[PDB]
Structure 1
Amino acid sequence: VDFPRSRLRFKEKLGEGQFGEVHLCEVDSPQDLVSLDFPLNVGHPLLVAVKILRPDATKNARNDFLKEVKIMSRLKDPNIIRLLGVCVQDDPLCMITDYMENGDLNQFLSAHQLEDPGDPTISYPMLLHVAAQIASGMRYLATLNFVHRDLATRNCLVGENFTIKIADFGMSRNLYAGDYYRVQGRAVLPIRWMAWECILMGKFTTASDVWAFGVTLWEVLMLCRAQPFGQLTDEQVIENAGEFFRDQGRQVYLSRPPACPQGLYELMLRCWSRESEQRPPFSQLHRFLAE
């Protein structure tokens, strides 16, 4: 049974995508809608984000939208985006999720400086808290044997009090076009976040998600101040994968961020182990970061 679409009132656009755009909507007097799937605290109207399939969508776009509903219906964790409701029995097709009022994590961290017109700062423990939450969400996806394939701060959302949820906004956003390697007729690839075996073999696993987490953790500790391997070309990043394969000590790594102690950097390096099996599981990464 659908969420009652009439209870949504459009406020503004937040973003757009390959098979739907995301609108900020208001829900008046939401108390009668509360359920195991639809939580509420309560500025008395509830704000939600709604991804909507517009009227001129291609058949291919509609199919991808309906499959995204199915994929997201799997997701049941405090640090993963969740479907509060859907409207799919008639058009327009809608996915309803929590409004994450501080937007994507990359833009959020880019707007802060590490604790030494106001001046937004973030503390080192809070950075660790951000990182721990990402690891907790990934720990959950690992239990589902669900491979994310595009973990990065651009795909994470920030709510109140530095709460984090992992999401997936796809690979077509102009804002982050430089984070993907495009060859005509091939899958688009986030190569600067990809494990060497992914670059060479095009297959993604939980272990390559762990590598991408290492790069995401590096982003967080950089406060997103620069692109991974930013002074290298896409081609050099791809060649670096070859050097991991050959294992003659000529592969290169992301450097230690200014805000990152050597002990935490050693954890990053463990995420970038040549051998998939030597990379720490997310349960271990989460324990380290939280404790």
Structure 2
Amino acid sequence: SMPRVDFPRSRLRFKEKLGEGQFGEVHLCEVDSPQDLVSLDFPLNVRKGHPLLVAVKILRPDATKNARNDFLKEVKIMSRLKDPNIIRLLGVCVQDDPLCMITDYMENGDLNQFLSAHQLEQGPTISYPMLLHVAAQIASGMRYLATLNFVHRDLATRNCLVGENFTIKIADFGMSRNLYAGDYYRVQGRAVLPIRWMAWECILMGKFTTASDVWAFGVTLWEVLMLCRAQPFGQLTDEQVIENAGEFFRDQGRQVYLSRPPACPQGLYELMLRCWSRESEQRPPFSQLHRFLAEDA
């Protein structure tokens, strides 16, 4: 943790359960007069007498030593991350049970669900420059993580949350949602990996770097431009995805690239292809990616 004191528990008014997991639950709560509890570098846009909505992740009160240790590890990592496009840890309750971590609340859910409910410009719609701005926010969030020497290792639209006015917050749900079980591949009956988003060198040698995050961003950019209508490499089985990673390693031109999304102009698709360069050093840094997406595209 980075908060010096526990967030006062009595200031969280329960509104609604947001989900239940093996280790606990997530509650939507209200906080009255939050100015004295909320860090000054975080925006408060509440009318007089209106409360701030926050998300509270609560660890089961009978959790194991291990699950409790995992929970506190997640708290410490989140306490470091202060950026307009990264989920924010607003407070914690860790001096007594049950353990709690309080995040800002992104009322529109994860980005994959959000884009699925939009059509390209009926129901709710979204246009090409708005999709560029979504991806630019992700790139901006990732550029910040890179400056911390922090490797996300699971960037994908399912791990981005959407607030008001299309604001994007990068997050990490872990691998704890049945909805996305198909996006992970179990290796030798133990760990689970997001192979369709991983660079060939993550698949084959287990090396995770900002450079492989750049690769993942390219797949995530492809998702955004597809409006999340299709799993990346959907035509390939998991074993074919792993074989495709062999083809990248051999670089004989038999490797398979994701196709240009219909809404994607050629110059932008060419930028995506550079995120999948075989050499880590030839992938563009996030600073270059954000510049292109916020301006040149």
TM-score by length of 2: 0.94
In 2 relative to 1, CA 256–80 (structure 1 residues): closer, same or farther, beyond 3 Å?
same
Displacement of 1:90: 1.1
Aligned equivalents of 1:87, 1:38: Cα separation in 2: 19
Contact 2:233–2:241 (Cα < 8 Å) also in 1: yes
Contact 1:20–1:65 (Cα < 8 Å) also in 2: no
1:52-88 Cα offsets, whole Å, 9 max, x none, are: 1121322211000000000001101110111111111
Structure 1 residues 227-236 or 3-12, which shifts more? 3-12
In 2 relative to 1, CA 269–16 (structure 1 residues): closer, same or farther, beyond 3 Å?
farther
In 2 relative to 1, CA 221–163 (structure 1 residues): closer, same or farther, beyond 3 Å?
same
What is aligned with 1:35? 39
1:92-115 Cα offsets, whole Å, 9 max, x none, are: 111111110101000000000111
Aligned equivalents of 2:188, 2:25: Cα separation in 1: 25
SS for the counterpart of 1:12 is: strand
Displacement of 1:31: 3.8
In 2 relative to 1, CA 131–38 (structure 1 residues): closer, same or farther, beyond 3 Å?
closer
Structure 1 residues 10-19 or 174-183, which shifts more? 10-19
SS for the counterpart of 1:85 is: strand
Displacement of 1:149: 0.2
Aligned equivalents of 1:72, 1:53: Cα separation in 2: 16
Structure 1 residues 48-57 or 18-27, which shifts more? 18-27
Displacement of 1:183: 3.0
Query: Which runs of structure 2 are paired with 1:116-265 in the superposition (5 Å)?
Result: 119-265=123-269
Aligned equivalents of 2:150, 2:282: Cα separation in 1: 20
Aligned equivalents of 2:31, 2:158: Cα separation in 1: 27
Displacement of 1:249: 0.6
| Percent of matched pairs sharing the same residue | 100
In 2 relative to 1, CA 128–52 (structure 1 residues): closer, same or farther, beyond 3 Å?
same
Unpaired runs of 5+ in structure 1?
Answer: none
Structure 1 residues 20-29 or 33-42, which shifts more? 33-42
Aligned equivalents of 2:10, 2:35: Cα separation in 1: 15
SS for the counterpart of 1:102 is: coil
Aligned equivalents of 1:285, 1:41: Cα separation in 2: 30
Displacement of 1:12: 1.4
Structure 1 residues 207-216 or 28-37, which shifts more? 28-37
TM-score by length of 1: 0.96
Structure 1 vs Structure 2 CA RMSD: 1.4
Aligned equivalents of 2:108, 2:153: Cα separation in 1: 24
Aligned equivalents of 1:58, 1:66: Cα separation in 2: 12
Aligned equivalents of 2:21, 2:275: Cα separation in 1: 31
SS for the counterpart of 2:28 is: strand
Aligned equivalents of 1:17, 1:210: Cα separation in 2: 30
SS for the counterpart of 2:176 is: coil
SS for the counterpart of 2:154 is: coil
Aligned equivalents of 1:38, 1:209: Cα separation in 2: 26
Aligned length: 288
In 2 relative to 1, CA 3–138 (structure 1 residues): closer, same or farther, beyond 3 Å?
same
Aligned equivalents of 1:53, 1:123: Cα separation in 2: 40
1:103 has 2:148 as partner? no
1:10-33 Cα offsets, whole Å, 9 max, x none, are: 111212445443211111233443
Displacement of 1:197: 0.6
SS for the counterpart of 1:288 is: helix
Structure 1 residues 23-32 or 193-202, which shifts more? 23-32
Structure 1 residues 42-51 or 258-267, which shifts more? 42-51
Structure 1 residues 250-259 or 35-44, which shifts more? 35-44
In 2 relative to 1, CA 44–138 (structure 1 residues): closer, same or farther, beyond 3 Å?
same
1:91 has 2:97 as partner? yes
Contact 1:18–1:61 (Cα < 8 Å) also in 2: no
1:202-235 Cα offsets, whole Å, 9 max, x none, are: 1211000000000000000000001001111000
Aligned equivalents of 2:42, 2:178: Cα separation in 1: 33
In 2 relative to 1, CA 137–180 (structure 1 residues): closer, same or farther, beyond 3 Å?
same
Contact 1:26–1:46 (Cα < 8 Å) also in 2: yes
Aligned equivalents of 2:59, 2:133: Cα separation in 1: 35
Match of 2:84 among 78, 89, 95: 78
Structure 1 residues 92-101 or 178-187, which shifts more? 178-187
Displacement of 1:127: 0.4
In 2 relative to 1, CA 32–247 (structure 1 residues): closer, same or farther, beyond 3 Å?
closer
Displacement of 1:34: 4.1
